[PDB]
Amino acid sequence: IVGGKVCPKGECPWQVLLLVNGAQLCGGTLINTIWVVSAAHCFDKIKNWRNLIAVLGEHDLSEHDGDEQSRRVAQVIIPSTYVPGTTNHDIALLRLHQPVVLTDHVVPLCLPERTFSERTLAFVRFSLVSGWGQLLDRGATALELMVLNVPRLMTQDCLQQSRSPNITEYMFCAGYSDGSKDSCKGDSGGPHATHYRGTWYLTGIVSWGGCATVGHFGVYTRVSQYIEWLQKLMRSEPRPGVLLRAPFP
Amino acid sequence: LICVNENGGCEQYCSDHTGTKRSCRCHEGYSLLADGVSCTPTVEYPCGKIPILEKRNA
Ligand SMILES: CCCCC(=O)NCc1cccc(-n2ncc(-c3cc4cnccc4[nH]3)c2O)c1
Ligand SMILES: [Ca+2]
Ligand SMILES: [Cl-]
Ligand SMILES: [Cl-]
Ligand SMILES: [Cl-]
C-alpha cells in the first residue's frame, strides 16, 4: 500500500496474510471461519502446494503478540476461466485445514448477495484496501498492516481518465491517477472492503497490473460476478489435492 | 418499495416480490427486526463488524 496509513491493530480483522515457506506471498480475506478469498495469480508459480499457510490476526510482522492464528491451506480453488499470468478472473477460494477461532482480532468480512452488491454497494464511492505490500513502487514492503481509502470508478470513466490489459466486466478500477495512492505488489489478494449502513462487505480483490503509476488506476477483481460461484463451492465437499480448478460460471 | 431504489429501505439484503411486495433479509449471524428492515447481530462476532470499535461506542 502506497500513500496509506497503518491500520490500527484489530481494525482490519478480516485481513489475511498468505505465506509460502514462511515467506510473504499475498494477502487474503476471511469470509467465514474456514474460507478465505484471494487472487488466482498468487498461485501461478506455486511448486509445493502443501507449504501454504494462512495467518489471521496478524498486524506487526516483526513480533508475536499471541493474537495470530495460523492455518494450513487445504484447498485452493480457481475458476476454469482464469489463465495464469493474466488478469481476468483473478480470484481464488481457499479452504483452511482447520477453522480459525473468531476473536476481537479475527473476524470475517461479509460476502454480500450479488443483487445487493450490484445495486447498492457498487455505488458506494469509497472503499478500503489493505495489506503488507510495498509502501512505494520499487520499495520495501510494510511491517505493519496498511490501509487505504480509494474511490471507485465506472469502467467508462476509468478508461477515459487513464493515460495493456482491458478492463473487463470482471474487473473494476479504483484509486487515483496522480501516482500518490495505490495498492502495490505484496497486497494482491487482499480486500477491497465497502461500508454500508454500519457493516462492511467484500466488493473487490487486489489484483495486479506498476504501482502508483501516474495516469493509471488500481485494478480490482469484481467480486459480485463470483458470489454464486463462491457460494456453491463453499457448500461442496473437499477434494483430494490442494489445487482445484472449478468451472465458471 | 423496490430493491433497486434506496436498497428497498433494507439495512442489508433485499428481495422483490410479486406485487407491491418487498422482503428484507439479513446475513447469517444477524436477525431482522420487527421494522422489517433492520438487522441486529445474534452472535458475538458477526461478519463485517469491528469489535474494538463496536465496543468503543458501546
Ligand atoms: C510477473 C510476476 C512474476 C511471476 C510470478 O511470480 N507470479 C506469481 C506471483 C505470486 C505472488 C505475487 C505476484 N506478483 N507479482 C507482481 C504482483 C503485483 C503487482 C501489482 C501492482 N499493483 C497492484 C498489485 C500488484 N501485484 C504480484 O502480486 C506474482
Ligand atoms: Ca504479529
Ligand atoms: Cl491447521
Ligand atoms: Cl459436493
Ligand atoms: Cl497436492
- Break chain A into its structural domains and give their ranges: 1-12+109-224, 13-108+225-238
The DSSP result for B8-58, as a single string, is GG-SSEEEEETTTEEEEE--TTEEE-TTSS-EEE-SSS-TT--HHHHHHT-
Q: Do domains A1-12+109-224 and A13-108+225-238 have the same CATH topology?
A: yes
The DSSP result for A52-117, as a single string, is EEEEES--BTT---S--EEEEEEEEEEETT--TTS-TT--EEEEESSPPPPBTTB-PPB---HHHH
Tell me which H or E stretch contains A11: none
Conformation bin of residue B29: beta by default, left when phi > 0, alpha when psi is -120 to 50: left
The distance from CA A169 to its chain's CA centroid, rounded to whole angstroms, is 18
For residues A206 and A198, give the distance between their C-alpha atoms in angstroms, rounded to a whole number. 23
For residues A205 and A27, give the distance between their C-alpha atoms in angstroms, rounded to a whole number. 9
Q: For B17, how many CA atoms within 13 A lie in the half-sphere containing its CB?
A: 7
Longest Cα–Cα distance of chain A, Å, equals 48
For residues B23 and B7, give the distance between their C-alpha atoms in angstroms, rounded to a whole number. 11
- Residue A32: name the closest of A240, A234, A246 by CA: A234
The DSSP 8-state label assigned to residue A230 in this structure reads H
Residues of B in contact with A111 (CB under 8 A): 47
Residues in chain A, overall count: 249
Positions at the binding site of A for substrate:
182
Domains and CATH numbers, chain B: 1-58 (2.10.25.10)
For residues A39 and A78, give the distance between their C-alpha atoms in angstroms, rounded to a whole number. 9
Longest Cα–Cα distance of chain B, Å, equals 43
The resolution of the experimental structure, rounded to one decimal in Å, is 1.9
Give burial (CB, 10 Å; 0-12/13-18/19+) of A50.
exposed
**What's phi and psi for B6, nearest 5 deg?**
60, 20
In testing the pocket of ligand 1, which one of A2, A21, A38, A44 has its CB within 8 Å of the most ligand atoms? Answer: A44
Could you tell me the fold of the domain covering A1-12+109-224?
A: Thrombin, subunit H (2.40.10)
Contacts of A233 (CB under 8 A, 6+ apart): A77, A93, A246
Answer whether B17's CB lies under 8 Å from B11's CB. no
For residues A147 and A131, give the distance between their C-alpha atoms in angstroms, rounded to a whole number. 7
Out of A59, A89, A90, A177, which one is annotated catalytic?
A90
Grid cell 480490482 in the structure block, residue: A220
Contacts of A141 (CB under 8 A, 6+ apart): A24, A132, A133, A134, A135, A186
The distance from CA B45 to its chain's CA centroid, rounded to whole angstroms, is 16
Tell me how far CA of residue A239 lies from CA of A34, A77, A99, A177, A247, in angstroms: 15, 10, 17, 43, 15
In chain B, the residue whose alpha carbon lies closest to the alpha carbon of A117 is: B13
Residue A230 Cα, gap to closest chain B Cα (Å): 16
Pairwise CB contact (< 8 Å): B51 & A119: no
For residues A17 and A79, give the distance between their C-alpha atoms in angstroms, rounded to a whole number. 21
For residues A55 and A70, give the distance between their C-alpha atoms in angstroms, rounded to a whole number. 4
Tell me how far CA of residue A139 lies from CA of A4, A102, B1, B47, in angstroms: 14, 34, 51, 34
Q: Pick B27's closest partner by Cβ from A13, A102, A110.
A: A110
- Which residues in A76-89 are b (16+ Cβ under 10 Å) and which e? bbbbebbeeeebbb
Experimental method reported for this structure: X-ray
| 3-state SS class at A209 | coil
At the top level of CATH, the class of A13-108+225-238 is mainly beta
Give burial (CB, 10 Å; 0-12/13-18/19+) of A244.
middle
